[PDB]
Design an enzyme around this catalytic site. Structure first.
Site, PDB file in Angstrom:
ATOM      1  CB  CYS A 152       4.184  -3.169  -0.842  1.00 61.22           C
ATOM      2  SG  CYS A 152       2.984  -2.864   0.480  1.00 61.22           S
ATOM      3  CD1 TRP A 156      -1.756  -4.045   8.895  1.00 58.40           C
ATOM      4  CD2 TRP A 156      -2.949  -2.175   8.484  1.00 58.40           C
ATOM      5  NE1 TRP A 156      -2.679  -4.339   7.906  1.00 58.40           N
ATOM      6  CE2 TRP A 156      -3.417  -3.211   7.639  1.00 58.40           C
ATOM      7  CE3 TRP A 156      -3.546  -0.903   8.398  1.00 58.40           C
ATOM      8  CZ2 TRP A 156      -4.462  -3.009   6.719  1.00 58.40           C
ATOM      9  CZ3 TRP A 156      -4.575  -0.698   7.495  1.00 58.40           C
ATOM     10  CH2 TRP A 156      -5.035  -1.756   6.669  1.00 58.40           C
TER      11      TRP A 156
HETATM   12  C1  HEM Z   1      -1.618  -1.244   5.112  1.00 59.83           C
HETATM   13  C2  HEM Z   1      -0.867  -2.264   5.510  1.00 59.83           C
HETATM   14  C3  HEM Z   1       0.453  -2.627   4.891  1.00 59.83           C
HETATM   15  C4  HEM Z   1       1.088  -3.822   5.066  1.00 59.83           C
HETATM   16  C5  HEM Z   1       0.552  -4.952   5.941  1.00 59.83           C
HETATM   17  C6  HEM Z   1       2.325  -3.738   4.342  1.00 59.83           C
HETATM   18  C7  HEM Z   1       3.273  -4.771   4.272  1.00 59.83           C
HETATM   19  C8  HEM Z   1       4.581  -4.575   3.830  1.00 59.83           C
HETATM   20  C9  HEM Z   1       5.685  -5.372   4.218  1.00 59.83           C
HETATM   21  C10 HEM Z   1       5.689  -6.559   5.156  1.00 59.83           C
HETATM   22  C11 HEM Z   1       6.781  -4.914   3.580  1.00 59.83           C
HETATM   23  C12 HEM Z   1       8.162  -5.533   3.758  1.00 59.83           C
HETATM   24  C13 HEM Z   1       8.880  -4.698   4.844  1.00 59.83           C
HETATM   25  C14 HEM Z   1      10.238  -5.180   5.255  1.00 59.83           C
HETATM   26  O1  HEM Z   1      10.599  -6.381   5.125  1.00 59.83           O
HETATM   27  O2  HEM Z   1      11.020  -4.334   5.767  1.00 59.83           O
HETATM   28  C15 HEM Z   1       6.365  -3.822   2.782  1.00 59.83           C
HETATM   29  C16 HEM Z   1       7.217  -3.134   1.952  1.00 59.83           C
HETATM   30  C17 HEM Z   1       6.789  -1.908   1.427  1.00 59.83           C
HETATM   31  N1  HEM Z   1       5.531  -1.334   1.468  1.00 59.83           N
HETATM   32 FE1  HEM Z   1       3.997  -1.955   2.470  1.00 59.83          FE
HETATM   33  N2  HEM Z   1       2.356  -2.596   3.624  1.00 59.83           N
HETATM   34  C18 HEM Z   1       1.321  -1.821   3.995  1.00 59.83           C
HETATM   35  C19 HEM Z   1       1.036  -0.499   3.585  1.00 59.83           C
HETATM   36  C20 HEM Z   1       1.929   0.297   2.833  1.00 59.83           C
HETATM   37  C21 HEM Z   1       1.747   1.667   2.567  1.00 59.83           C
HETATM   38  C22 HEM Z   1       0.614   2.527   3.104  1.00 59.83           C
HETATM   39  C23 HEM Z   1       2.794   2.050   1.736  1.00 59.83           C
HETATM   40  C24 HEM Z   1       3.015   3.413   1.204  1.00 59.83           C
HETATM   41  C25 HEM Z   1       1.919   4.105   0.854  1.00 59.83           C
HETATM   42  C26 HEM Z   1       3.620   0.914   1.515  1.00 59.83           C
HETATM   43  C27 HEM Z   1       4.767   0.883   0.711  1.00 59.83           C
HETATM   44  C28 HEM Z   1       5.709  -0.134   0.856  1.00 59.83           C
HETATM   45  C29 HEM Z   1       7.079  -0.001   0.277  1.00 59.83           C
HETATM   46  C30 HEM Z   1       7.642   1.150  -0.588  1.00 59.83           C
HETATM   47  C31 HEM Z   1       7.733  -1.130   0.612  1.00 59.83           C
HETATM   48  C32 HEM Z   1       9.188  -1.502   0.249  1.00 59.83           C
HETATM   49  C33 HEM Z   1      10.222  -0.785   1.144  1.00 59.83           C
HETATM   50  C34 HEM Z   1      11.645  -1.121   0.706  1.00 59.83           C
HETATM   51  O3  HEM Z   1      11.919  -1.444  -0.469  1.00 59.83           O
HETATM   52  O4  HEM Z   1      12.572  -1.099   1.549  1.00 59.83           O
HETATM   53  N3  HEM Z   1       3.022  -0.156   2.127  1.00 59.83           N
HETATM   54  N4  HEM Z   1       4.965  -3.644   2.876  1.00 59.83           N
HETATM   55  N1  LIG Z   2       4.303  -2.797   7.617  1.00 61.26           N
HETATM   56  C1  LIG Z   2       5.266  -1.937   7.278  1.00 61.26           C
HETATM   57  N2  LIG Z   2       6.539  -2.354   7.229  1.00 61.26           N
HETATM   58  C2  LIG Z   2       7.502  -1.745   6.441  1.00 61.26           C
HETATM   59  C3  LIG Z   2       7.298  -1.408   5.089  1.00 61.26           C
HETATM   60  C4  LIG Z   2       8.298  -0.802   4.334  1.00 61.26           C
HETATM   61  C5  LIG Z   2       9.563  -0.547   4.921  1.00 61.26           C
HETATM   62  C6  LIG Z   2       9.755  -0.896   6.258  1.00 61.26           C
HETATM   63  C7  LIG Z   2      11.084  -0.567   6.960  1.00 61.26           C
HETATM   64  O1  LIG Z   2      12.141  -1.244   6.317  1.00 61.26           O
HETATM   65  C8  LIG Z   2      13.024  -0.465   5.531  1.00 61.26           C
HETATM   66  C9  LIG Z   2      14.341  -1.203   5.751  1.00 61.26           C
HETATM   67  C10 LIG Z   2      15.592  -0.434   5.350  1.00 61.26           C
HETATM   68  C11 LIG Z   2      16.563  -1.557   4.963  1.00 61.26           C
HETATM   69  O2  LIG Z   2      17.497  -1.154   3.961  1.00 61.26           O
HETATM   70  C12 LIG Z   2      18.844  -1.455   4.338  1.00 61.26           C
HETATM   71  C13 LIG Z   2      19.680  -0.236   4.045  1.00 61.26           C
HETATM   72  C14 LIG Z   2      20.851   0.013   4.768  1.00 61.26           C
HETATM   73  C15 LIG Z   2      21.609   1.150   4.478  1.00 61.26           C
HETATM   74  C16 LIG Z   2      21.193   2.032   3.473  1.00 61.26           C
HETATM   75  C17 LIG Z   2      20.015   1.788   2.749  1.00 61.26           C
HETATM   76  N3  LIG Z   2      19.582   2.621   1.763  1.00 61.26           N
HETATM   77  C18 LIG Z   2      20.075   3.850   1.590  1.00 61.26           C
HETATM   78  N4  LIG Z   2      19.554   4.844   2.302  1.00 61.26           N
HETATM   79  C19 LIG Z   2      21.201   4.117   0.629  1.00 61.26           C
HETATM   80  C20 LIG Z   2      22.595   4.061   0.726  1.00 61.26           C
HETATM   81  C21 LIG Z   2      23.252   4.408  -0.464  1.00 61.26           C
HETATM   82  C22 LIG Z   2      22.427   4.754  -1.535  1.00 61.26           C
HETATM   83  S1  LIG Z   2      20.787   4.617  -0.978  1.00 61.26           S
HETATM   84  C23 LIG Z   2      19.265   0.649   3.042  1.00 61.26           C
HETATM   85  C24 LIG Z   2      15.700  -2.724   4.469  1.00 61.26           C
HETATM   86  N5  LIG Z   2      14.379  -2.417   4.965  1.00 61.26           N
HETATM   87  C25 LIG Z   2       8.742  -1.471   7.014  1.00 61.26           C
HETATM   88  C26 LIG Z   2       4.947  -0.532   6.878  1.00 61.26           C
HETATM   89  C27 LIG Z   2       5.598   0.669   6.970  1.00 61.26           C
HETATM   90  C28 LIG Z   2       4.897   1.698   6.381  1.00 61.26           C
HETATM   91  C29 LIG Z   2       3.668   1.344   5.803  1.00 61.26           C
HETATM   92  S2  LIG Z   2       3.435  -0.381   6.019  1.00 61.26           S
END
Ligand code: HEM
Ligand SMILES: N=C(Nc1cccc(COC[C@@H]2C[C@H](OCc3cccc(NC(=N)c4cccs4)c3)CN2)c1)c1cccs1
Ligand code: HEM
Ligand SMILES: N=C(Nc1cccc(COC[C@@H]2C[C@H](OCc3cccc(NC(=N)c4cccs4)c3)CN2)c1)c1cccs1
Ligand SMILES: C[C@H](O)[C@H](O)[C@H]1CNc2nc(N)[nH]c(=O)c2N1
Ligand SMILES: C[C@H](O)[C@H](O)[C@H]1CNc2nc(N)[nH]c(=O)c2N1
Ligand SMILES: [Zn+2]
Lengths: 407, 411
Positions: free
Chosen positions: A106, A278
């Site tokens: 993140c 956001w």
């Molecule tokens: C406040 C503004 C925030 C910005 C601009 C931001 C930005 C991002 C971005 C760009 C990603 C990559 C998403 C992707 O490529 O799909 C990300 C991943 C993530 N962020 Fe944030 N974030 C924010 C807030 C948060 C909040 C509030 C949480 C949870 C409390 C969070 C938890 C995560 C997690 C867990 C991931 C990784 C998701 C994954 O592995 O698939 N972030 N963040």
């Molecule tokens: N600015 C934002 N963007 C943001 C941040 C975090 C995540 C995302 C959305 O992206 C998530 C996607 C999801 C995507 O994962 C690919 C994928 C495909 C199929 C399965 C799984 N994973 C599984 N459930 C498993 C299968 C077998 C064992 S586990 C993952 C990468 N990525 C947006 C925010 C969202 C919330 C706060 S900030």
């Protein structure tokens, strides 16, 4: 055991010790790096509980106080007796903030400590969950001035009574396979869109149909609910220079809100924990719009721009990519919906790493995810060495519920 | 054990068994990933196993594993090690070794080309003047008047570690950098320390923005000597833009031949500390990194000024806009002057095809995603969406310390 990371643009060296606390495993070994792979009982629970309470009590300068020892005693007795335990509110809030703080993928974590935590542990039904979720959506949207929030449903018990939001995000657009062979809407969501239709949803069959929520309470069959449209803030996408851009019919939603992840705090599992912040502009303009398997709009945009699409070396894709992203940012800004560009986001993240190195001894970071999907090396994160490792509390992936649930 | 990688754009899944042959370590453990860290005197003792493993690979590649020729070669190498403490590679093994070091280079996106490598054997070289002559021939061969051909030149291997052959330059062809009294930099800031070394060794610096550096060459552990590459051998490309006629007035040019000269080549436990190799550029190397890194020529501001973009907020994406224009210019210039170059779309697409082929015929292809993904437009190239496994095979190219840091001066 003490590890250095260097920024190759500024020569700043930070020393990481925080990694030594790391508990979970990376996927890597001494022989193979898995850095670019997307996904690599009573007896178990008490160490997990203890290690959590230890860091919590240390965070409030009460490590080794009677307040600390008493709570450890109390949770220990409760595990012994009930085989699980309950977090105090203070612990829940702390645990959730730290799950964000520890999210190595993140880029937005400079904000980690400003997170509104909605405790929905008292929830019992899908209608309840719908209510909690609508309140979260309205609170976080805040008429376009977005605020970070998480809503936390009851924790896993025997795993046959899980709460789950089946949607991958609270707000997403439908995808439909056509007679055509092509795809209308968002191809990422084709399957979920069919699960909704298979459940009863009246699909408008358009390009940008807001998906209904499919909520599962207590291990029951999930139920459909439409979010009130007045609660879904959307942005029409136009360009500050190209008049024809609006003719493309593009829009996106303001509120990114992840709902399929599992929050782990002190060994306890929260399978329904939708969270929102956001957008960084590139998420929509590079990935949502330009990924080949997504709305995949580069061809039409370049066409409208009259670029030479004959040879890859004209960089027509790159030209179109930039304009599309200028437009995403311009539209959100014009409509006063919070958005961050990749330059500002990555600059803030460097500053956040410096803060964390100083205050915490490190910051787990996954370079593969942190570096934006356009203009990588003109953002400062590209030149920043990062160490990736897993700290708890955390957000984790979990399998999509339709593969799991017993109907 | 079998390991799977998935492409998330195409759902193509590949299976890796090659990773089982990897010996060297990665930097990572089960508790930390060091995948973004830029960098994470041999006894007879360690030497024979390294030679044996290499010769087994070589004899298997030529479908002669276990032959009498194979066995006699092992015996002969074995004898030579215990008698002399080292051994010499046959020409064929050297060639095979150098190609495989490239094949195994996990950070190289151009490996589709690995089997077309001209190997120049310079192991009879004895002096710095000899090295200069070898290097001039390599540059003229590789340049081929714009139609670039990959090549490596291989100087004598390390013996006691006190008689090393080294090219002090990081690339055979690179521009000088000069730190000014007011603290600004003229030319390439990356080459300041090296430029200062040259000057002190007696180079007369023209002190311009694009002065081709002299070669600083060390033979046989002796103090290095200066030489000027004949200018007629240094192919250069003036940078202009197809639509923007003011672009030429920025005064930019680059050299056509990228030629890395500071790496160490390891083959069968032998160490070749001077092994300059060259291919051709991917456009982003110049237009993104050399021109637009803040610590390099840093032309983004001046380019966006001339384009009259809104520079008052990063969210205009003026930087991203200037970046694409500069990269179009670089590709346009090279193609116009018929100097080989590849764009990052073409290069990454070819890499994916190479990679799939490698999984098919070889059982894997080690790849470092941090490095393979281009530094602009990452996700509109297929590699961004490709899972990759990074591990280390030998033969290999390795980093080594800068020689000014280790050299014992003779005077
Ligand atoms: C406040 C503004 C925030 C910005 C601009 C931001 C930005 C991002 C971005 C760009 C990603 C990559 C998403 C992707 O490529 O799909 C990300 C991943 C993530 N962020 Fe944030 N974030 C924010 C807030 C948060 C909040 C509030 C949480 C949870 C409390 C969070 C938890 C995560 C997690 C867990 C991931 C990784 C998701 C994954 O592995 O698939 N972030 N963040
Ligand atoms: N600015 C934002 N963007 C943001 C941040 C975090 C995540 C995302 C959305 O992206 C998530 C996607 C999801 C995507 O994962 C690919 C994928 C495909 C199929 C399965 C799984 N994973 C599984 N459930 C498993 C299968 C077998 C064992 S586990 C993952 C990468 N990525 C947006 C925010 C969202 C919330 C706060 S900030
Ligand atoms: C034929 C055309 C080739 C192209 C287009 C090409 C492309 C590249 C590029 C773009 C890089 C990244 C460079 C950087 O960012 O600094 C690279 C790395 C590398 N390539 Fe190539 N390559 C080619 C040929 C070769 C040859 C002939 C060799 C050696 C025989 C080689 C070995 C390497 C190595 C060892 C690296 C990693 C350097 C490091 O870790 O610092 N490549 N390749
Ligand atoms: N198309 C090409 N480009 C290409 C390919 C490979 C490499 C490069 C240029 O590589 C140079 C930049 C520079 C960068 O190296 C970083 C760096 C900086 C300072 C020192 C060291 N390493 C050391 N000497 C050590 C210090 C302590 C222990 S070791 C490394 C990698 N990279 C270009 C080709 C060249 C030759 C055939 S294709
Ligand atoms: C295969 C590769 O790991 C995968 O494409 C990753 C790369 N980096 C990413 N980075 C972000 N921020 N989001 C992503 O979805 C991905 N995808
Ligand atoms: C810190 C980081 O690993 C470093 O900046 C790397 C990232 N990826 C790279 N990729 C390539 N091809 N060349 C580079 O110089 C770098 N630099
Ligand atoms: Zn790793």
């Amino acid at each position: 055991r003490f590890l250095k990371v260097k920024n190759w643009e500024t020569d700043v060296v930070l020393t990481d010790t925080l990694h030594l606390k790391s508990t979970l495993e990376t996927g890597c070994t001494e022989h193979i790096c898995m850095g670019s792979i997307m996904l690599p009982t009573k007896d178990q629970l008490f160490p997990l509980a203890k290690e959590f309470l230890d860091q919590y009590y240390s965070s409030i300068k009460r490590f080794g106080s009677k307040a600390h020892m008493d709570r450890l005693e109390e949770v220990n007795k409760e595990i012994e007796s009930t085989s699980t335990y309950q977090l105090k509110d203070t612990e829940l809030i702390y645990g959730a903030k730290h799950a964000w703080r520890n999210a190595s993928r993140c880029v937005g974590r400079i904000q980690w400590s400003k997170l509104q935590v909605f405790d929905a542990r008292d929830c019992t039904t899908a209608h309840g969950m719908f209510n909690y979720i609508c309140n979260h959506v309205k609170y976080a949207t805040n008429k376009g001035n977005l605020r970070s929030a998480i809503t936390i449903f009851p924790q896993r018990t025997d795993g046959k009574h899980d709460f789950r939001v089946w949607n991958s995000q609270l707000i997403r657009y439908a995808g439909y396979k056509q007679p055509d062979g092509s795809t209308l809407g968002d191809p990422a969501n084709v399957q979920f869109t069919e699960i909704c239709i298979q459940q009863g949803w009246k699909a408008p069959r358009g390009r940008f149909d807001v998906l209904p929520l499919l909520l599962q309470a207590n291990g029951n069959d999930p139920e459909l609910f439409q979010i009130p449209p007045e609660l879904v803030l959307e942005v029409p996408i136009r360009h500050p220079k190209f008049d024809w851009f609006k003719d493309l019919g593009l829009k996106w939603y303001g509120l990114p809100a992840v709902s399929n992840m599992l929050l782990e705090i002190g060994g306890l599992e929260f399978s329904a924990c939708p969270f929102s912040g956001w957008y960084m502009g590139t998420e929509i303009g590079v990935r949502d719009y330009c990924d080949n398997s997504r709305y995949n709009i580069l061809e039409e945009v370049a066409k409208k721009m009259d670029l030479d699409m004959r040879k890859t070396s004209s960089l027509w894709k790159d030209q179109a990519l930039v304009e599309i992203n200028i437009a995403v940012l311009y539209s959100f800004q014009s409509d006063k919906v919070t958005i961050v560009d990749h330059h500002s986001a990555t600059e803030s993240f460097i500053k956040h790493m410096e803060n964390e190195y100083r205050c915490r001894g490190g910051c787990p970071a996954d370079w593969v995810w942190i570096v934006p999907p356009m203009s990588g090396s003109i953002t400062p994160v590209f030149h920043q060495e990062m160490l990736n490792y897993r700290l708890t509390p955390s957000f984790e992936y979990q399998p999509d519920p339709w593969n799991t649930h017993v109907w």
